[PDB]
Tab-separated table of C-alpha atoms in Angstrom:
chain	number	residue	atom	x	y	z
Y	1	UNK	CA	78.082	-6.196	4.112
Y	2	UNK	CA	76.301	-3.300	2.096
Y	3	UNK	CA	73.575	-1.476	3.813
Y	4	UNK	CA	70.110	-1.434	2.234
Y	5	UNK	CA	67.216	-3.457	1.040
Y	6	UNK	CA	67.817	-4.692	4.696
Y	7	UNK	CA	64.035	-7.034	5.600
Y	8	UNK	CA	62.689	-8.068	9.192
Y	9	UNK	CA	60.833	-11.209	9.173
Y	10	UNK	CA	58.073	-11.667	11.790
Y	11	UNK	CA	57.268	-15.319	12.614
Y	12	UNK	CA	54.092	-15.187	14.534
Y	13	UNK	CA	51.917	-18.342	15.888
Y	14	UNK	CA	52.851	-21.792	16.291
Y	15	UNK	CA	52.900	-22.212	12.417
Y	16	UNK	CA	54.892	-19.475	11.260
Y	17	UNK	CA	57.583	-20.223	13.923
Y	18	UNK	CA	57.647	-23.787	12.633
Y	19	UNK	CA	57.831	-22.842	9.217
Y	20	UNK	CA	61.018	-21.033	10.035
Y	21	UNK	CA	62.961	-24.115	10.047
Y	22	UNK	CA	63.125	-24.557	6.557
Y	23	UNK	CA	62.926	-21.191	5.702
Y	24	UNK	CA	65.944	-19.994	7.193
Y	25	UNK	CA	67.974	-23.329	6.581
Y	26	UNK	CA	66.934	-22.769	2.840
Y	27	UNK	CA	68.058	-19.127	3.291
Y	28	UNK	CA	71.448	-20.157	4.860
Y	29	UNK	CA	72.363	-22.971	2.546
Y	30	UNK	CA	71.784	-20.868	-0.515
Y	31	UNK	CA	74.090	-18.459	1.015
Y	32	UNK	CA	76.824	-20.844	2.401
Y	33	UNK	CA	75.964	-20.345	5.915
Y	34	UNK	CA	75.384	-23.477	8.320
Y	35	UNK	CA	72.761	-22.756	10.691
Y	36	UNK	CA	74.322	-24.887	13.305
Y	37	UNK	CA	77.480	-22.971	13.603
Y	38	UNK	CA	76.103	-19.467	12.228
Y	39	UNK	CA	79.413	-19.309	10.272
Y	40	UNK	CA	79.982	-19.695	6.339
Y	41	UNK	CA	79.739	-23.553	5.382
Y	42	UNK	CA	82.377	-23.839	2.703
Y	43	UNK	CA	85.441	-21.492	1.625
Y	44	UNK	CA	83.624	-21.654	-1.706
Y	45	UNK	CA	81.933	-18.227	-1.703
Y	46	UNK	CA	80.355	-16.245	-4.938
Y	47	UNK	CA	81.735	-12.549	-5.127
Y	48	UNK	CA	78.438	-10.692	-4.619
Y	49	UNK	CA	75.981	-12.120	-2.487
Y	50	UNK	CA	73.102	-10.064	-1.240
Y	51	UNK	CA	72.582	-12.222	2.229
Y	52	UNK	CA	72.446	-9.067	3.988
Y	53	UNK	CA	68.650	-8.687	2.956
Y	54	UNK	CA	67.616	-11.340	5.203
Y	55	UNK	CA	70.729	-12.145	7.607
Y	56	UNK	CA	72.772	-10.246	10.260
Y	57	UNK	CA	76.297	-10.612	9.996
Y	58	UNK	CA	77.912	-10.285	13.490
Y	59	UNK	CA	81.435	-10.460	14.100
Y	60	UNK	CA	80.314	-13.727	15.962
Y	61	UNK	CA	78.789	-15.242	12.546
Y	62	UNK	CA	75.335	-14.739	10.943
Y	63	UNK	CA	71.769	-14.408	12.466
Y	64	UNK	CA	68.511	-14.033	11.333
Y	65	UNK	CA	66.947	-10.268	11.198
Y	66	UNK	CA	64.196	-11.842	12.677
Y	67	UNK	CA	61.590	-11.853	15.356
Y	68	UNK	CA	59.802	-15.004	16.546
Y	69	UNK	CA	56.711	-14.276	18.179
Y	70	UNK	CA	54.291	-16.148	19.846
Y	71	UNK	CA	51.481	-16.494	22.815
Y	72	UNK	CA	52.864	-19.767	23.900
Y	73	UNK	CA	56.681	-21.061	24.160
Y	74	UNK	CA	55.694	-24.387	22.114
Y	75	UNK	CA	56.852	-23.654	18.374
Y	76	UNK	CA	60.037	-21.961	19.732
Y	77	UNK	CA	60.822	-25.219	22.044
Y	78	UNK	CA	60.558	-27.179	18.639
Y	79	UNK	CA	63.409	-24.675	17.230
Y	80	UNK	CA	65.891	-24.672	20.310
Y	81	UNK	CA	65.064	-28.248	21.827
Y	82	UNK	CA	64.076	-30.368	18.505
Y	83	UNK	CA	66.230	-29.018	15.874
Y	84	UNK	CA	68.890	-27.939	18.407
Y	85	UNK	CA	69.617	-24.465	16.668
Y	86	UNK	CA	69.406	-22.186	19.773
Y	87	UNK	CA	72.100	-20.510	18.468
Y	88	UNK	CA	70.290	-19.356	15.457
Y	89	UNK	CA	67.023	-19.008	16.871
Y	90	UNK	CA	68.282	-17.003	20.138
Y	91	UNK	CA	66.065	-15.164	22.811
Y	92	UNK	CA	67.022	-11.991	21.995
Y	93	UNK	CA	64.934	-12.579	19.053
Y	94	UNK	CA	62.056	-13.925	20.984
Y	95	UNK	CA	58.901	-12.255	21.931
Y	96	UNK	CA	56.879	-14.893	23.979
Y	97	UNK	CA	53.698	-15.210	26.495
Y	98	UNK	CA	52.312	-17.987	27.990
Y	99	UNK	CA	48.520	-17.442	27.684
Y	100	UNK	CA	47.857	-18.522	24.452
Y	101	UNK	CA	44.908	-17.260	21.950
Y	102	UNK	CA	42.895	-20.625	21.935
Y	103	UNK	CA	42.335	-20.423	18.096
Y	104	UNK	CA	40.223	-17.527	18.724
Y	105	UNK	CA	41.332	-14.450	16.328
Y	106	UNK	CA	40.396	-11.916	19.007
Y	107	UNK	CA	42.270	-13.268	21.851
Y	108	UNK	CA	45.446	-12.832	19.769
Y	109	UNK	CA	44.700	-9.265	18.496
Y	110	UNK	CA	44.237	-8.308	22.387
Y	111	UNK	CA	46.778	-10.380	24.517
Y	112	UNK	CA	48.870	-9.290	21.390
Y	113	UNK	CA	48.663	-6.028	22.083
Y	114	UNK	CA	50.393	-6.310	25.523
Y	115	UNK	CA	53.560	-7.367	23.786
Y	116	UNK	CA	53.528	-4.672	20.891
Y	117	UNK	CA	55.328	-1.918	22.888
Y	118	UNK	CA	58.293	-4.161	23.497
Y	119	UNK	CA	58.243	-5.600	19.875
Y	120	UNK	CA	58.512	-1.642	18.528
Y	121	UNK	CA	61.306	-1.222	21.086
Y	122	UNK	CA	63.269	-4.127	20.058
Y	123	UNK	CA	62.659	-2.643	16.403
Y	124	UNK	CA	63.804	0.476	17.064
Y	125	UNK	CA	66.946	-0.314	19.325
Y	126	UNK	CA	67.981	-3.235	16.748
Y	127	UNK	CA	66.923	-2.664	13.072
Y	128	UNK	CA	69.103	-0.443	10.811
Y	129	UNK	CA	67.558	2.808	9.757
Y	130	UNK	CA	67.819	1.731	6.114
Y	131	UNK	CA	65.365	-1.408	6.930
Y	132	UNK	CA	63.167	-1.507	3.520
Y	133	UNK	CA	60.088	-3.194	5.107
Y	134	UNK	CA	58.710	-6.438	7.341
Y	135	UNK	CA	57.778	-9.621	6.137
Y	136	UNK	CA	54.745	-11.635	8.311
Y	137	UNK	CA	55.094	-15.095	8.124
Y	138	UNK	CA	51.944	-16.698	9.718
Y	139	UNK	CA	48.942	-18.842	9.776
Y	140	UNK	CA	45.683	-17.585	9.380
Y	141	UNK	CA	43.092	-20.615	10.870
Y	142	UNK	CA	44.090	-19.952	14.828
Y	143	UNK	CA	44.755	-17.295	17.216
Y	144	UNK	CA	47.926	-15.804	17.553
Y	145	UNK	CA	49.203	-16.012	13.920
Y	146	UNK	CA	45.816	-14.754	12.595
Y	147	UNK	CA	44.940	-11.910	15.278
Y	148	UNK	CA	48.585	-11.132	16.516
Y	149	UNK	CA	49.551	-11.187	12.984
Y	150	UNK	CA	46.607	-9.098	12.027
Y	151	UNK	CA	47.782	-6.768	14.612
Y	152	UNK	CA	51.463	-6.605	13.572
Y	153	UNK	CA	50.338	-6.003	9.910
Y	154	UNK	CA	48.504	-2.961	11.157
Y	155	UNK	CA	50.740	-1.649	13.825
Y	156	UNK	CA	54.318	-1.804	11.432
Y	157	UNK	CA	52.116	-0.228	8.587
Y	158	UNK	CA	50.798	2.757	10.673
Y	159	UNK	CA	54.380	3.011	12.692
Y	160	UNK	CA	56.536	2.634	9.197
Y	161	UNK	CA	54.438	3.917	6.476
Y	162	UNK	CA	57.364	4.468	4.536
Y	163	UNK	CA	58.137	0.916	4.504
Y	164	UNK	CA	56.881	-2.378	2.764
Y	165	UNK	CA	54.728	-4.925	4.642
Y	166	UNK	CA	54.691	-8.237	2.975
Y	167	UNK	CA	52.419	-11.026	4.199
Y	168	UNK	CA	52.979	-14.784	3.449
Y	169	UNK	CA	49.940	-16.260	4.700
Y	170	UNK	CA	49.058	-19.892	5.205
Y	171	UNK	CA	45.275	-20.678	4.791
Y	172	UNK	CA	43.432	-23.183	6.718
Y	173	UNK	CA	43.622	-27.082	5.746
Y	174	UNK	CA	41.554	-29.835	6.925
Y	175	UNK	CA	44.517	-31.294	9.318
Y	176	UNK	CA	45.429	-28.526	12.422
Y	177	UNK	CA	41.877	-27.240	11.123
Y	178	UNK	CA	39.576	-25.556	13.724
Y	179	UNK	CA	35.777	-25.368	13.230
Y	180	UNK	CA	36.724	-21.881	14.105
Y	181	UNK	CA	38.822	-21.200	10.775
Y	182	UNK	CA	36.629	-19.491	8.505
Y	183	UNK	CA	36.023	-16.918	11.346
Y	184	UNK	CA	39.786	-16.338	11.586
Y	185	UNK	CA	40.388	-16.450	8.489
Y	186	UNK	CA	37.711	-13.893	7.046
Y	187	UNK	CA	38.877	-11.660	10.138
Y	188	UNK	CA	42.675	-11.846	9.271
Y	189	UNK	CA	42.301	-11.388	5.395
Y	190	UNK	CA	39.786	-8.520	6.139
Y	191	UNK	CA	42.943	-6.950	8.409
Y	192	UNK	CA	45.480	-7.718	5.889
Y	193	UNK	CA	43.420	-6.445	2.642
Y	194	UNK	CA	43.540	-2.785	4.937
Y	195	UNK	CA	46.976	-2.994	6.111
Y	196	UNK	CA	49.199	-5.314	3.877
Y	197	UNK	CA	51.328	-4.151	0.774
Y	198	UNK	CA	51.024	-7.623	-0.530
Y	199	UNK	CA	49.425	-11.151	0.576
Y	200	UNK	CA	50.868	-14.042	-0.763
Y	201	UNK	CA	48.824	-16.839	0.434
Y	202	UNK	CA	49.927	-20.612	0.857
Y	203	UNK	CA	47.150	-23.485	1.719
Y	204	UNK	CA	48.401	-26.927	3.384
Y	205	UNK	CA	45.537	-28.715	1.683
Y	206	UNK	CA	47.109	-28.186	-1.920
Y	207	UNK	CA	50.374	-29.779	-0.906
Y	208	UNK	CA	48.266	-32.588	0.526
Y	209	UNK	CA	46.437	-32.541	-2.774
Y	210	UNK	CA	49.935	-33.327	-4.167
Y	211	UNK	CA	50.361	-36.046	-2.143
Y	212	UNK	CA	47.450	-38.058	-3.103
Y	213	UNK	CA	47.965	-37.775	-6.665
Y	214	UNK	CA	51.955	-38.797	-6.899
Y	215	UNK	CA	53.672	-41.961	-6.066
Y	216	UNK	CA	56.526	-39.562	-5.135
Y	217	UNK	CA	57.053	-38.734	-1.514
Y	218	UNK	CA	56.066	-35.266	-1.324
Y	219	UNK	CA	55.448	-35.441	2.717
Y	220	UNK	CA	55.798	-38.903	4.716
Y	221	UNK	CA	55.265	-36.861	8.350
Y	222	UNK	CA	52.607	-34.214	9.293
Y	223	UNK	CA	53.897	-30.684	9.005
Y	224	UNK	CA	57.248	-31.717	9.382
Y	225	UNK	CA	57.358	-32.246	6.360
Y	226	UNK	CA	54.382	-29.952	5.224
Y	227	UNK	CA	55.808	-26.776	7.013
Y	228	UNK	CA	59.249	-28.119	5.614
Y	229	UNK	CA	57.725	-27.873	2.226
Y	230	UNK	CA	55.759	-24.318	2.805
Y	231	UNK	CA	59.208	-23.096	4.285
Y	232	UNK	CA	61.150	-24.143	1.053
Y	233	UNK	CA	58.501	-22.458	-1.165
Y	234	UNK	CA	58.341	-19.015	0.530
Y	235	UNK	CA	62.235	-18.855	0.802
Y	236	UNK	CA	62.203	-19.764	-2.966
Y	237	UNK	CA	59.752	-16.554	-3.736
Y	238	UNK	CA	62.058	-14.286	-1.622
Y	239	UNK	CA	64.897	-15.365	-4.095
Y	240	UNK	CA	64.167	-12.105	-6.194
Y	241	UNK	CA	65.196	-10.127	-3.084
Y	242	UNK	CA	68.327	-11.707	-2.160
Y	243	UNK	CA	70.113	-12.553	-5.420
Y	244	UNK	CA	71.389	-10.862	-8.259
Y	245	UNK	CA	69.547	-10.852	-11.567
Y	246	UNK	CA	67.086	-9.035	-13.904
Y	247	UNK	CA	64.375	-9.514	-11.737
Y	248	UNK	CA	66.285	-8.203	-8.666
Y	249	UNK	CA	63.421	-6.590	-6.440
Y	250	UNK	CA	62.859	-4.995	-3.055
Y	251	UNK	CA	59.897	-5.444	-1.327
Y	252	UNK	CA	58.056	-2.462	-2.648
Y	253	UNK	CA	58.764	-3.625	-6.158
Y	254	UNK	CA	57.456	-7.329	-5.474
Y	255	UNK	CA	53.945	-5.143	-4.455
Y	256	UNK	CA	54.069	-2.745	-7.134
Y	257	UNK	CA	54.170	-5.315	-9.811
Y	258	UNK	CA	51.656	-7.163	-8.830
Y	259	UNK	CA	48.878	-4.840	-7.232
Y	260	UNK	CA	46.937	-2.829	-9.661
Y	261	UNK	CA	44.275	-1.854	-7.714
Y	262	UNK	CA	44.671	-1.421	-3.902
Y	263	UNK	CA	42.400	-4.689	-3.319
Y	264	UNK	CA	44.342	-6.791	-5.737
Y	265	UNK	CA	46.652	-8.015	-3.084
Y	266	UNK	CA	46.450	-11.443	-2.885
Y	267	UNK	CA	48.803	-13.817	-4.737
Y	268	UNK	CA	48.886	-17.344	-5.543
Y	269	UNK	CA	52.282	-18.802	-5.770
Y	270	UNK	CA	53.603	-21.639	-7.697
Y	271	UNK	CA	57.087	-23.777	-7.582
Y	272	UNK	CA	58.458	-26.553	-9.742
Y	273	UNK	CA	60.175	-28.762	-8.763
Y	274	UNK	CA	58.814	-29.633	-5.567
Y	275	UNK	CA	60.408	-32.864	-5.294
Y	276	UNK	CA	64.392	-34.400	-6.145
Y	277	UNK	CA	62.581	-37.002	-8.251
Y	278	UNK	CA	60.106	-34.346	-10.464
Y	279	UNK	CA	63.723	-32.292	-10.619
Y	280	UNK	CA	65.672	-35.444	-12.115
Y	281	UNK	CA	62.321	-36.367	-14.505
Y	282	UNK	CA	61.928	-32.914	-16.069
Y	283	UNK	CA	63.269	-29.816	-18.368
Y	284	UNK	CA	62.829	-26.068	-18.121
Y	285	UNK	CA	59.745	-26.191	-20.484
Y	286	UNK	CA	58.381	-28.644	-18.087
Y	287	UNK	CA	58.492	-26.682	-14.655
Y	288	UNK	CA	57.247	-23.448	-16.709
Y	289	UNK	CA	54.158	-25.565	-17.836
Y	290	UNK	CA	53.647	-26.701	-14.114
Y	291	UNK	CA	54.076	-23.476	-12.511
Y	292	UNK	CA	50.908	-22.212	-14.809
Y	293	UNK	CA	49.122	-25.390	-13.849
Y	294	UNK	CA	46.901	-25.133	-10.978
Y	295	UNK	CA	47.899	-28.776	-9.679
Y	296	UNK	CA	51.032	-27.051	-8.542
Y	297	UNK	CA	49.140	-24.112	-7.267
Y	298	UNK	CA	49.956	-23.335	-3.472
Y	299	UNK	CA	46.156	-22.477	-3.099
Y	300	UNK	CA	43.056	-24.897	-3.981
Y	301	UNK	CA	41.893	-24.190	-7.343
Y	302	UNK	CA	39.341	-25.968	-9.613
Y	303	UNK	CA	41.020	-24.673	-12.924
Y	304	UNK	CA	43.114	-21.502	-13.705
Y	305	UNK	CA	41.792	-18.196	-14.003
Y	306	UNK	CA	42.369	-15.255	-15.733
Y	307	UNK	CA	45.805	-13.413	-15.125
Y	308	UNK	CA	45.903	-9.728	-14.155
Y	309	UNK	CA	49.842	-9.469	-13.291
Y	310	UNK	CA	52.165	-12.382	-13.254
Y	311	UNK	CA	55.991	-12.643	-12.131
Y	312	UNK	CA	58.257	-15.645	-12.974
Y	313	UNK	CA	61.537	-16.443	-11.878
Y	314	UNK	CA	64.279	-19.093	-13.506
Y	315	UNK	CA	66.834	-20.210	-11.110
Y	316	UNK	CA	69.720	-22.194	-11.905
Y	317	UNK	CA	71.188	-24.019	-15.174
Y	318	UNK	CA	68.639	-22.447	-17.287
Y	319	UNK	CA	69.869	-21.967	-20.857
Y	320	UNK	CA	68.451	-18.009	-21.300
Y	321	UNK	CA	67.855	-18.756	-25.223
Y	322	UNK	CA	65.519	-21.251	-24.177
Y	323	UNK	CA	64.098	-18.899	-21.639
Y	324	UNK	CA	63.414	-16.341	-23.968
Y	325	UNK	CA	61.789	-19.139	-26.555
Y	326	UNK	CA	59.365	-20.666	-23.518
Y	327	UNK	CA	57.785	-17.373	-22.881
Y	328	UNK	CA	56.852	-16.556	-25.809
Y	329	UNK	CA	55.002	-19.642	-26.079
Y	330	UNK	CA	53.345	-19.281	-22.685
Y	331	UNK	CA	52.193	-15.495	-23.154
Y	332	UNK	CA	50.402	-17.343	-26.353
Y	333	UNK	CA	48.621	-19.812	-23.936
Y	334	UNK	CA	48.178	-18.189	-21.053
Y	335	UNK	CA	44.324	-16.460	-20.250
Y	336	UNK	CA	45.116	-13.216	-19.482
Y	337	UNK	CA	42.132	-11.197	-17.955
Y	338	UNK	CA	39.953	-8.793	-20.227
Y	339	UNK	CA	42.141	-5.786	-21.111
Y	340	UNK	CA	45.552	-6.611	-20.072
Y	341	UNK	CA	48.125	-6.574	-22.904
Y	342	UNK	CA	49.959	-10.088	-22.327
Y	343	UNK	CA	53.434	-8.151	-22.255
Y	344	UNK	CA	52.018	-6.351	-19.010
Y	345	UNK	CA	50.536	-9.303	-17.745
Y	346	UNK	CA	53.758	-11.521	-17.120
Y	347	UNK	CA	57.102	-10.329	-16.486
Y	348	UNK	CA	60.138	-12.867	-15.870
Y	349	UNK	CA	63.831	-12.856	-14.924
Y	350	UNK	CA	66.680	-15.767	-14.561
Y	351	UNK	CA	68.380	-16.535	-11.584
Y	352	UNK	CA	71.760	-18.018	-11.519
Y	353	UNK	CA	71.953	-19.157	-7.660
Y	354	UNK	CA	69.746	-22.359	-7.509
Y	355	UNK	CA	67.955	-24.464	-4.848
Y	356	UNK	CA	70.609	-26.682	-3.098
Y	357	UNK	CA	68.931	-29.863	-3.618
Y	358	UNK	CA	67.896	-29.010	-7.473
Y	359	UNK	CA	69.599	-28.158	-10.838
Y	360	UNK	CA	66.620	-25.717	-11.639
Y	361	UNK	CA	63.782	-24.341	-10.588
Y	362	UNK	CA	61.009	-22.002	-11.505
Y	363	UNK	CA	58.921	-20.262	-9.347
Y	364	UNK	CA	55.312	-17.893	-10.354
Y	365	UNK	CA	53.677	-15.218	-8.553
Y	366	UNK	CA	50.262	-14.496	-9.691
Y	367	UNK	CA	47.671	-11.978	-9.124
Y	368	UNK	CA	45.036	-14.223	-10.303
Y	369	UNK	CA	41.094	-13.880	-10.653
Y	370	UNK	CA	40.860	-17.413	-9.387
Y	371	UNK	CA	41.579	-16.351	-6.111
Y	372	UNK	CA	37.885	-14.985	-5.732
Y	373	UNK	CA	36.894	-19.192	-6.030
Y	374	UNK	CA	39.262	-19.889	-3.550
Y	375	UNK	CA	37.466	-17.206	-1.278
Y	376	UNK	CA	34.248	-17.969	-2.305
Y	377	UNK	CA	34.349	-21.083	-0.588
Y	378	UNK	CA	35.829	-19.313	2.635
Y	379	UNK	CA	32.633	-17.256	2.628
Y	380	UNK	CA	30.618	-20.501	2.098
Y	381	UNK	CA	32.022	-21.902	5.220
Y	382	UNK	CA	31.701	-18.682	7.097
Y	383	UNK	CA	28.169	-18.148	6.484
Y	384	UNK	CA	27.319	-21.968	6.958
Y	385	UNK	CA	28.418	-21.368	10.406
Y	386	UNK	CA	27.811	-17.333	11.115
Y	387	UNK	CA	24.004	-17.530	9.751
Y	388	UNK	CA	23.228	-20.047	12.697
Y	389	UNK	CA	25.535	-18.459	15.507
Y	390	UNK	CA	27.838	-21.055	15.878
Y	391	UNK	CA	30.924	-20.923	17.268
Y	392	UNK	CA	30.547	-17.133	18.073
Y	393	UNK	CA	30.645	-16.848	21.590
Y	394	UNK	CA	34.468	-16.264	22.173
Y	395	UNK	CA	34.898	-13.960	19.558
Y	396	UNK	CA	32.222	-11.343	21.466
Y	397	UNK	CA	33.897	-11.962	24.615
Y	398	UNK	CA	37.325	-10.909	23.498
Y	399	UNK	CA	35.768	-7.879	21.955
Y	400	UNK	CA	34.934	-8.576	18.213
Y	401	UNK	CA	31.339	-8.327	18.047
Y	402	UNK	CA	29.263	-10.285	15.555
Y	403	UNK	CA	28.816	-6.975	13.780
Y	404	UNK	CA	32.518	-6.858	13.441
Y	405	UNK	CA	32.393	-10.301	11.974
Y	406	UNK	CA	29.525	-8.985	9.432
Y	407	UNK	CA	31.294	-6.098	8.299
Y	408	UNK	CA	34.744	-8.377	7.737
Y	409	UNK	CA	32.629	-10.662	5.721
Y	410	UNK	CA	30.815	-7.950	3.617
Y	411	UNK	CA	34.171	-6.542	3.008
Y	412	UNK	CA	35.126	-10.113	1.922
Y	413	UNK	CA	33.063	-10.361	-0.669
Y	414	UNK	CA	33.684	-6.761	-2.021
Y	415	UNK	CA	37.265	-8.080	-2.614
Y	416	UNK	CA	35.547	-11.141	-4.282
Y	417	UNK	CA	33.429	-9.314	-6.520
Y	418	UNK	CA	36.084	-6.942	-7.771
Y	419	UNK	CA	38.099	-9.978	-8.901
Y	420	UNK	CA	35.279	-11.328	-10.400
Y	421	UNK	CA	34.721	-8.105	-12.212
Y	422	UNK	CA	38.096	-7.999	-13.438
Y	423	UNK	CA	37.777	-11.443	-14.809
Y	424	UNK	CA	34.920	-10.539	-16.555
Y	425	UNK	CA	32.214	-13.007	-15.252
Y	426	UNK	CA	30.549	-11.126	-12.477
């Protein structure tokens, strides 16, 4: 393949590695590759494909340019034993311990430091020198994905300051929800605010919300369909980086197009359609309108907020003449933040390659002031436990003082206030 624009994906934690099943299955099938055989799946290949952005073409076949990192071997057993994809999720890409983090951010940050030198060794000895950056896929409610993920986000930014560090971060839900999740989320989001170039946030609560308000089946099994859906959504967000088009971005351009101020780096993603039934009942306009509907947000929002910067992607069999017309009407109805010209608050583009199961797809990445509301509910749950000194013992034991917890919370509130000043409401 052609050198350049190569990305190294880092799955950290149980969720981040388990999400990698349908993340890489969707990526492989959109570039005509069988994840079971590491080979192409059909002789029908399109003339230009940027599969080298996420996949490595060896003489024996295609492999993920990824490292699968965890302080416990449970998630990689799910990939090799349950899914039978050991030829794709192979051992040379695995950095594993067997101690665990026990859902404490501090234990993953400190135990993860003992695996950092070997992770940097694999990056130096195996990654191309034209590597554009890193993609970190992890959860924020536990200890490995949060603590080790925060450490890796910080370590990669310090050792490779010329490359892009992008975080696909999953917020805590009500299932797989520890009472320690408010502490871990605030600690992780404070670190990511300092070292990540862009944090796209996912919430299992939002997918559950869509289940309870739909006859159609979006999940019928726990995480095996929820993490299945998260992997497909965050693979659709990467479509701008691996397919030719007007909005073909690299990691830096994806951050530059959405991060106006250094603190406004938290993006809300929206994808429609989510199911085959929705795809068979919807037109292009309906898919654009749902993406700007908080019901289809991957973060749980009450209403909509005000948009600072947004990037929309048309995927597949979409008439470009109607795409021009739809976005003129959407710019008139969308509430932009006070001071943003509508032409500078929303950019869009068409991608010819569509998801395998859908004729068309629409994806929205939005830097929206409504993330202050999602974060203020995290702050309320943080303070409901911290002001009573509840569930704090194991963070101090592992080296994160209660003063360090306070500094993370107070810097978390400063980000909320910045988004609210931009909104013009606080």
